[PDB]
Design a protein around this ligand. Structure first.
Ligand SMILES: COc1cc(-c2cncc(-c3ccc(C4CCN(C)CC4)cc3)c2C)cc(OC)c1OC
Ligand SMILES: COc1cc(-c2cncc(-c3ccc(C4CCN(C)CC4)cc3)c2C)cc(OC)c1OC
Ligand SMILES: COc1cc(-c2cncc(-c3ccc(C4CCN(C)CC4)cc3)c2C)cc(OC)c1OC
Ligand SMILES: COc1cc(-c2cncc(-c3ccc(C4CCN(C)CC4)cc3)c2C)cc(OC)c1OC
Lengths: 292, 283
């Protein structure tokens, strides 16, 4: 029973479209890629070929298809469906308590450590576009990481399955200093893990703002909302991150709450300009497991 | 909208180290479904990446329909779906069938047309493509008498090839691997062997040769790399041209053509475009 019914469009952008569909009587998400993003479709298909990729905190794969008649081609990715939508969507109007905030951020750390660590199998994987729109919320209050179209793979028993020649990929708002200044070591797998850690810190900040403490919470804002234009360019981001050495501000009310004090310390250890100074995903996961 | 993806697998028409090929049915229409072995997974990726780069459409190239990857409990299933050619492969067809002048030329000109289309860069278009496993089992026969080239799982854009069809520069490891033209010239060598296989089955003066694969008389049934190197590189043997061909003007011209695909020096061999021109002036 391979047939799918497309029921409603839940997203449209430069990436193509995502549809809620029905398959074997279950909701599925069907992404139809833009022509512009055909290399992402193939990269994501290469990533999902890994059976040991499967994890509670990684978006689960059902099928990938490239179809053509005559001169046009369609590119399909079919996954499990998360009706709560992205973490970006969820944070807009929901506030969090301590338990819900830690559950979300530990689940993302668990997914990211699963990607980064080689299994002897699954290669080590760096995501390269981590952000709150690429994280889905599950009904159990954990998240899963989505969109492996820019991912890079590495095997310690051999070598490295790397990028296109274009290093200006990833979402500009979440790009690490070394991506924005184009000094990143492109032949070094560890470089790409360190870019993910930078972006994880920004996602931690986005989530923590929405956790209530002492009857106070911040409104949802994207990273660097206060220092860059609404739709920031690559150069806008380079200016604030590389020239101005800006990092997201820690609201002072956080320092009255032990959880938010711990999270502020963790996100600062994701934001060093020196990529090798940043925490590992495993260390973040260990730290969040210990925080109450 | 409904996306009908069900494909009914009706009969297995091929089994091998590569996996299986099935005749299937989608929406009342025959398709061919290649189900890849774990052994041959990289061929699915290479062909899929090529068709994602350039959607080839040519009467003498097997017609792409889809690349499918389906998650199973503990495995990934990889299918390539193409048009279906009920007459099967040229290899199959030549075992039983003899040819006349018109059929022989139509077959070999259609293969040369497919191969030149792969080899040529078209601007505005397609990258140049070398096949790297051209042989009579990777050519399908169509009802209109033309053939189409199949299996781009080893193709390169600008697993090893079948040993029996490897050019001398592949067997002696002197191939200039950093030069794309090298891979075109390896295909031309293999094309010459296919042209020999076909020409043997063309009747002249009531005479025809039995189907044999290239080098049948000088290598074992399943030849080693070394077996082939000794024949092709050390002794510099080439397939036999029977005397009876020299009584027939078509087979005389085809013998000259196949000799010009088999030079030891890869840069001396004819190009696919020159082979096409030569064939349009025979008969
Ligand atoms: C994969 O293969 C097959 C696919 C199909 C098929 C089924 N539904 C719809 C389509 C289609 C419609 C419209 C557009 C275009 C039209 C112009 N512009 C607006 C862009 C969009 C593209 C595609 C097709 C091609 C049929 C087939 O056979 C009859 C196929 O072959 C097996
Ligand atoms: C990020 O990337 C991918 C995501 C998905 C995916 C999976 N489940 C659910 C969704 C979703 C559903 C619904 C909403 C709501 C939110 C707000 N409301 C106002 C409108 C709609 C948002 C999101 C998505 C987008 C599938 C993908 O591929 C098939 C993705 O690409 C890899
Ligand atoms: C996913 O998988 C398979 C799909 C199909 C298939 C079945 N029905 C319809 C289609 C179709 C084509 C094109 C469009 C649209 C695209 C955008 N719009 C502006 C124009 C037209 C819609 C739908 C397809 C591609 C067949 C399959 O097997 C033969 C598939 O499995 C490999
Ligand atoms: C070389 O490679 C590929 C080939 C094909 C393919 C396409 N049409 C038809 C065929 C076929 C059909 C029927 C017979 C036999 C069965 C009955 N009788 C005893 C004589 C005839 C043989 C062959 C094939 C094998 C598809 C592929 O992929 C989907 C191939 O791989 C790219």
């Amino acid at each position: 029973a391979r047939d799918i019914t497309l029921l409603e469009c839940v997203g449209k952008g430069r990436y193509g479209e995502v549809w809620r569909g029905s398959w074997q009587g279950e909701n599925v998400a069907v992404k139809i890629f833009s022509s512009r993003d055909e290399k992402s479709w193939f990269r994501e298909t290469e990533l999902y070929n890994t059976v040991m990729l499967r994890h509670e905190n990684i978006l689960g794969f059902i099928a990938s298809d490239m179809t053509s008649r005559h001169s046009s081609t369609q590119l399909w990715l079919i996954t499990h469906y998360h009706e709560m939508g992205s973490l970006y969507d969820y944070l807009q109007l929901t506030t969090l308590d301590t338990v819900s905030c830690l559950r979300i951020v530990l689940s993302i750390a668990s997914g990211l450590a699963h990607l980064h660590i080689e299994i002897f199998g699954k290669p080590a994987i760096a995501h390269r576009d981590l952000k709150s729109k690429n994280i889905l919320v599950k009904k159990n209050g954990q998240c899963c990481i989505a969109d492996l179209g820019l991912a890079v793979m590495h095997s310690q028993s051999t070598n490295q399955l790397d990028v296109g020649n274009n290093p200006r990929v990833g979402t500009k708002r979440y790009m690490a200093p070394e991506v924005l200044d184009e000094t990143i070591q492109v032949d070094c797998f560890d470089s790409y893990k360190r870019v993910d850690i930078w972006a994880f810190g920004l996602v931690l900040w986005e989530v923590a703002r929405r956790m209530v403490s002492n009857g106070i919470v911040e409104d949802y804002k994207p990273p660097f909302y206060d220092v860059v234009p609404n739709d920031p360019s690559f150069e806008d981001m380079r200016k604030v991150v590389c020239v101005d050495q800006q990092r997201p501000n820690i609201p002072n009310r956080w320092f009255s709450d032990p959880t938010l004090t711990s999270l502020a310390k963790l996100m600062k250890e994701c934001w060093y300009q020196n990529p090798s100074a940043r925490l590992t995903a495993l260390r973040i996961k260990k730290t969040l497991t210990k925080i109450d």
